[PDB]
Ligand binder design. Structure first.
Ligand code: A1B6B
Ligand code: ZN
Length: 139
């Protein structure tokens, strides 16, 4: 679990979105596993606008933050689940690191701010849904 609060927006993993998220929907994309809903309160976070390939993410299954090198946002195959059929997930970045179901929503940050959120994992890898291209979150 976990979310990004920026201005009047909440960014969450689409497969974890609540009834309230869907009732206040701004945008969603199943191919990215992202959903953005509106909020009444002003957010707590800032978004990075960069091409960093290093950062630190929060791993709830270990109650720890870990530094990672991660790949560029790309199209990567993801196996079927109670949430999605087998498909290519876009804007996904992989890193060598620990992750388990329940870790989705953990924030990845670089020196410039929020980069993305944990969205995939397994076999010593962790995948992050990128949010740096969503320039409209700022305005
Ligand atoms: C995070 C993790 C780590 C180790 C094992 C399993 C997992 C869970 C995982 O990969 N997904 C669960 C939901 C979100 C997901 C997607 N993006 O399509 C992928 C369906
Ligand atoms: Zn950066």
């Amino acid at each position: 679990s976990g979310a990004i609060y920026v201005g009047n927006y909440r960014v969450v993993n689409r497969h974890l979105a609540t009834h309230n998220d869907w009732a206040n929907l701004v945008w969603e994309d199943s191919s990215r596993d992202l959903l953005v809903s509106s909020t009444t309160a002003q957010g707590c976070d800032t978004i990075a606008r960069c091409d960093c390939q290093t950062g630190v993410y929060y791993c709830s299954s270990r109650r720890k933050h870990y530094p990672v090198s991660f790949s560029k946002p790309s199209l990567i195959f993801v196996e079927a689940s109670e949430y999605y059929p087998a498909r290519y997930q876009s804007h996904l970045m992989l890193a060598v690191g620990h992750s388990e179901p329940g870790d989705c929503g953990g924030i990845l940050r670089c020196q410039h701010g929020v980069v993305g959120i944990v969205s995939t994992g397994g076999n010593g890898l962790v995948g992050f849904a990128d949010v740096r291209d969503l320039l409209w979150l700022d305005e």
